[PDB]
Amino acid sequence: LQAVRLYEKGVILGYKRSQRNQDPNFTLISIKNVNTKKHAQFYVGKRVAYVYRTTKHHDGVKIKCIWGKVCRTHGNSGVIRAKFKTHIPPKAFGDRVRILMYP
Amino acid sequence: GKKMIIKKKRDEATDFERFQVYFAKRELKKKMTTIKNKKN
Amino acid sequence: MYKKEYVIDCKGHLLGRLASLIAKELLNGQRIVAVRCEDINISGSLYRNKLKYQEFLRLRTNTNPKKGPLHLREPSKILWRCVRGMLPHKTYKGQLALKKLKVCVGMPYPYDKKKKYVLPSALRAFRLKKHRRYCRLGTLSSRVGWNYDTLVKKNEVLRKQVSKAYYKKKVNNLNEKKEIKTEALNLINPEQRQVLENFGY
Amino acid sequence: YAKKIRNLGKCAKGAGVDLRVHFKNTYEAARAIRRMKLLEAKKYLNDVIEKKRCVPFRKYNGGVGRTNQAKEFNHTQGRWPAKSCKFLLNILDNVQANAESRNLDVSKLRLIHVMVNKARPGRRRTYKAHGRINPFMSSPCHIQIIAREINISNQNRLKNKSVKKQQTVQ
Amino acid sequence: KHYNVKGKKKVLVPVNAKKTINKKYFGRKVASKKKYVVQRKLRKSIEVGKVAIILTGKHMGKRCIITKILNSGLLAVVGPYEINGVPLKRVDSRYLVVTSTNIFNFENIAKLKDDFLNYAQDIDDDSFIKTLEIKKKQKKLLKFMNNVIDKIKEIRKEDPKVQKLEGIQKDIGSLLKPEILKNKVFAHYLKSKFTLRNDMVLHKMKF
Amino acid sequence: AVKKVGKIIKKRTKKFTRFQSNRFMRVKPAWRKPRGIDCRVRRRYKGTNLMPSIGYGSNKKTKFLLPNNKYKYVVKNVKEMEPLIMNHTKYCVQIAHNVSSKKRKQIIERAKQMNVSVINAKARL
RNA sequence: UUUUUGUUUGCUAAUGUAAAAGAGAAAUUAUAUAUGUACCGGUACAUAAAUAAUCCUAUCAC
RNA sequence: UUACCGAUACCAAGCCAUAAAAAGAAGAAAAAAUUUUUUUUUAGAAUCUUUUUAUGAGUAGAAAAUCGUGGGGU
RNA sequence: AUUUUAAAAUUAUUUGAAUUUUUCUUCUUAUAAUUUAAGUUGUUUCUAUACAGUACUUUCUUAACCCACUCGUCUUGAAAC
Numbered sequence A: 001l002q003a004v005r006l007y008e009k010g011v012i013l014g015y016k017r018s019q020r021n022q023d024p025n026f027t028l029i030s031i032k033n034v035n036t037k038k039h040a041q042f043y044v045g046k047r048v049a050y051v052y053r054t055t056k057h058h059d060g061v062k063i064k065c066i067w068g069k070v071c072r073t074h075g076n077s078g079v080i081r082a083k084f085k086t087h088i089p090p091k092a093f094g095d096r097v098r099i100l101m102y103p
Numbered sequence B: 001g002k003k004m005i006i007k008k009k010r011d012e013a014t015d016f017e018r019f020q021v022y023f024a025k026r027e028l029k030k031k032m033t034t035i036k037n038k039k040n
Numbered sequence C: 001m002y003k004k005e006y007v008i009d010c011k012g013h014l015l016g017r018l019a020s021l022i023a024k025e026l027l028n029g030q031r032i033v034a035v036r037c038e039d040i041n042i043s044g045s046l047y048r049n050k051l052k053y054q055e056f057l058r059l060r061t062n063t064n065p066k067k068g069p070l071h072l073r074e075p076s077k078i079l080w081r082c083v084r085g086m087l088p089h090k091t092y093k094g095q096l097a098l099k100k101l102k103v104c105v106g107m108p109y110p111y112d113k114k115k116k117y118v119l120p121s122a123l124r125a126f127r128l129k130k131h132r133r134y135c136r137l138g139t140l141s142s143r144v145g146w147n148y149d150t151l152v153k154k155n156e157v158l159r160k161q162v163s164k165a166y167y168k169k170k171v172n173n174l175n176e177k178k179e180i181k182t183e184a185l186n187l188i189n190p191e192q193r194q195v196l197e198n199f200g201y
Numbered sequence D: 001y002a003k004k005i006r007n008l009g010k011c012a013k014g015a016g017v018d019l020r021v022h023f024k025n026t027y028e029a030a031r032a033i034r035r036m037k038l039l040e041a042k043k044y045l046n047d048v049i050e051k052k053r054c055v056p057f058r059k060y061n062g063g064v065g066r067t068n069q070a071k072e073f074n075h076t077q078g079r080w081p082a083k084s085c086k087f088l089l090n091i092l093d094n095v096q097a098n099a100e101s102r103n104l105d106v107s108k109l110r111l112i113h114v115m116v117n118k119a120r121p122g123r124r125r126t127y128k129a130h131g132r133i134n135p136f137m138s139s140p141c142h143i144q145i146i147a148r149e150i151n152i153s154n155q156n157r158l159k160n161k162s163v164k165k166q167q168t169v170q
Numbered sequence E: 001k002h003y004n005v006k007g008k009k010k011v012l013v014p015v016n017a018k019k020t021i022n023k024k025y026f027g028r029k030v031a032s033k034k035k036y037v038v039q040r041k042l043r044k045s046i047e048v049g050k051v052a053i054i055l056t057g058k059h060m061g062k063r064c065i066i067t068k069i070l071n072s073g074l075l076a077v078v079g080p081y082e083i084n085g086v087p088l089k090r091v092d093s094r095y096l097v098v099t100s101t102n103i104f105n106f107e108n109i110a111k112l113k114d115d116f117l118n119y120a121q122d123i124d125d126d127s128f129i130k131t132l133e134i135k136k137k138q139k140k141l142l143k144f145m146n147n148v149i150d151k152i153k154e155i156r157k158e159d160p161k162v163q164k165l166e167g168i169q170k171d172i173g174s175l176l177k178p179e180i181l182k183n184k185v186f187a188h189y190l191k192s193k194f195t196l197r198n199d200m201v202l203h204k205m206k207f
Numbered sequence F: 001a002v003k004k005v006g007k008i009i010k011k012r013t014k015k016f017t018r019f020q021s022n023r024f025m026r027v028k029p030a031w032r033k034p035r036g037i038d039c040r041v042r043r044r045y046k047g048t049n050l051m052p053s054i055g056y057g058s059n060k061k062t063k064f065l066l067p068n069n070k071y072k073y074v075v076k077n078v079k080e081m082e083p084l085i086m087n088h089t090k091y092c093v094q095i096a097h098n099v100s101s102k103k104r105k106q107i108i109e110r111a112k113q114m115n116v117s118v119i120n121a122k123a124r125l
Numbered sequence G: 001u002u003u004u005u006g007u008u009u010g011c012u013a014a015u016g017u018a019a020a021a022g023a024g025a026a027a028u029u030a031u032a033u034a035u036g037u038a039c040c041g042g043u044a045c046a047u048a049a050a051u052a053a054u055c056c057u058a059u060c061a062c
Numbered sequence H: 001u002u003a004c005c006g007a008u009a010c011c012a013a014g015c016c017a018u019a020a021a022a023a024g025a026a027g028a029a030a031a032a033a034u035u036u037u038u039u040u041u042u043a044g045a046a047u048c049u050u051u052u053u054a055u056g057a058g059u060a061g062a063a064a065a066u067c068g069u070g071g072g073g074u
Numbered sequence I: 001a002u003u004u005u006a007a008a009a010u011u012a013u014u015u016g017a018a019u020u021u022u023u024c025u026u027c028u029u030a031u032a033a034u035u036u037a038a039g040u041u042g043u044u045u046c047u048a049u050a051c052a053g054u055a056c057u058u059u060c061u062u063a064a065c066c067c068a069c070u071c072g073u074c075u076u077g078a079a080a081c
């Protein structure tokens, strides 16, 4: 096996939202097999990284990453809210995110 | 009941124990593979 | 919904609920193949359903029916339409989600060899009381002109035989594996064996 | 001229000040010409004058018919703007002459810049309706043509990271 | 030194004021008015001979045994180099998931504990932080490719503190290795990398 | 959004452009406050241009500090340069747009002597 | 098809991904029962019955 | 019956303005260097400075503070 | 440039009491220190041994999620057919 996971998989969903009001300050994350509030709480302090690819190289690379902290659980069904260093692009709304094991 | 207990055991296991189990499985696979080869 | 592509076996499901289930997943970011769409059930009585369909058909655009409500009468098509209804398809994300969905009548080329999933919170057996009238979608489609129902059924039947054949082989393989395991459990190491036994395997 | 050239030694220019031809037709012709060997362009112009090949009216396409020769440019509309074409041909000829006067081979010259700007309208009067005088102006043009002869950071930490990545890959 | 407020008993560690801040209407003064900062106090699972998984390093996922509570809060870790490949590595408590398994709980290795402790004690805090000179030297190589890397490695080796650390690691390996090898399964475990799979839920894990 | 750099907080980096300045050429971006009934901007409907307001203002303490943390001072002449001999860490010189090249050079030289930063030293360089 | 390096005059070397980290999993069918198996839809015997709460597949470098 | 989501409303914190309120006509601090140099400041502008608290919708309208244009004396 | 003081609290001492007999028992006589007082500081990286680069700033550019109806106007009321 080449490469080791060490993170839980996730899907970076919408922003924190009304019915028709945005709130880009928080993102909503679905974490693989976590379906309840209680389970969600386990991940609360863990660090989240949205890694993404680009055409132009930057710090000599095609992959860059934005970091976040995972702030609180979100309503009954294991979803969590995550707050990031800089707000996530909505291009990301169906994308994968990584929830690391540290803190 | 048995399956429940197995599940419980799995839940309660230490990382090392999981690793041990994995090792055992691997060993079995090796042996199993050999047996299969022999059969063939 | 973290899989590459979920194949959903649409037999024995309850239409609208199924559609709803699909839609959310699609939105999230999941490739869904709704397969075997002839056997999706609707919670109303068959006649009622038919009437509803007729009514829907009647609402066409008055000036030029080339545009307006396209009354797609294939069961798969109907399902797709339903899914779309439950989506923000007028945006870009919604459109993408819609595209991601694929609907099939019966079972085609690759989706016979892929694992078929079931949505338990949408099943007819779990959502309807058995004294209420339900309606098979294929039948409904046939009633409102689909024609290719019998053919589809035949195809399904044919596929079933193949599946059975494959299943037998699979069973045999499983048995063989079990036998091998039984043989080899004595050939490992005592402590290891014990450990294995303890952890169910 | 409008173009950024750098070396004018491999270029030959030609201009038309105030041409008595319609701006739109001429523009279309110019467009048709653009990015072509000079001789080929000339040939094309000649053909259009003799109504053999059409110029495709793609920009100013309001009311222009529907010719058979337009299929050549993947378009449906096209015309044979005679006077305009003639004017353009004249300018091309001038350009060629200029090139000759220097030391450019006419076979390897490509039109790199075919600009048509609209000059000031020549005012005339038309008479309408219930004693109404209206402008019957022309749409004159300037034509500008240019032919041309055609043949970090290291960072130690970053470096280390890169090395690590390479190792992992291996 | 310690303070016992509300029944916590927090334990104080002497700190130095480094940051200077501009005065309101005259000359600058030091930022810190406090002289003692409360000690880190690690979790009730971090011990002295437990095996832990490094989450973030280059040795990402490797299973390394804990060594010394290094006073600065962050602890020392070793995956006995000759077995796992993890050197004498300083690490924060957060970037390590400590397993419930302890080395000194096994019947074979429990007797060689005092020596291990002594070794740990011998390791110090200042032996890790690279002095500026070395860094400067390393930098100086930037102004072919692999050659540069080699040079850097050489420079690293040269460091006397580094050498000492290496020696210590070697000693530890010598002390520990054979016993580990003898417990074959354990050795294998030590060697292997911890990876999450499509069944390991993480939130229900009790490792 | 907010643009923290140092302790320097900027609340609103985006310029407030005039309503509809983006719709008719004749309307410049320069903020003008909309009057009259049915403005939408005046009424502050979700989705329109915002109205500049006093809440946006920067902390009294860091206000006219530039990214450098020095108040910009315009300089036309050596005499003017001189008031900032006792202030090189707090005001930074900008040489007037209309200064001739020799004079500019002289000013730059003076600045270097004073240890005072020049924000536009490169004009006509 | 395989390999190598790259995609760090309008051009004439050339980059993009709504989604890789194991994106693992082919009976069928009933839901007040199904599935096999063996005979003649019927009979007899097994088998699933928190069914993915599972199973498979990982790390054994040289 | 819980749980949750959910406003520019509420709370906690910052900053901006307005209003009011406290109050105001002399002095070395630190760091870096190596006991002495260097680096920063070393404040006192009454519609001003420092701090405190509360408050902030707005057409017709009123007022204040600013900003800009053509010329004049300085 | 003396309310970042005074006290509180805490630590190690010292004198006297108390009924809540107690390694956080309280008051109090005295002394030092500290912070739970008296609104965040420290450690290690990184940028980086760089003069501008693909990093960093910022302008523009499209995307994308959510929202957003032509302004002025008279009018109880204008996005107004």
Ligand SMILES: O[C@H](c1cc(C(F)(F)F)nc2c(C(F)(F)F)cccc12)[C@@H]1CCCCN1
Pocket (backbone or CB within 6 Å): C015, C042, C049, C050, C052, C053, C055, C056, C059, C078, C081, C082, C140
């Ligand atoms: O929403 C109803 C309806 C529509 C359609 C569809 F548009 F897909 F053909 N199918 C329906 C069905 C369907 F047949 F199961 F699809 C059942 C009941 C109502 C339906 C119609 C729509 C017009 C007004 C109410 N009856």
Ligand SMILES: O[C@H](c1cc(C(F)(F)F)nc2c(C(F)(F)F)cccc12)[C@@H]1CCCCN1
Pocket (backbone or CB within 6 Å): H025
């Ligand atoms: O009020 C004193 C004062 C005195 C005198 C003086 F007596 F010289 F005229 N003049 C002052 C002035 C002055 F009048 F402008 F000179 C202003 C402010 C304070 C003054 C202050 C006291 C603080 C130190 C400065 N002078």
Ligand SMILES: [Mg+2]
Pocket (backbone or CB within 6 Å): F037, F038
């Ligand atoms: Mg109104």
Ligand SMILES: [Mg+2]
Pocket (backbone or CB within 6 Å): F037, F038, I078
């Ligand atoms: Mg209006």
Ligand SMILES: [Mg+2]
Pocket (backbone or CB within 6 Å): none
């Ligand atoms: Mg107001």
Ligand SMILES: [Mg+2]
Pocket (backbone or CB within 6 Å): I067
């Ligand atoms: Mg809208």
Ligand SMILES: [Mg+2]
Pocket (backbone or CB within 6 Å): I075
């Ligand atoms: Mg009216």
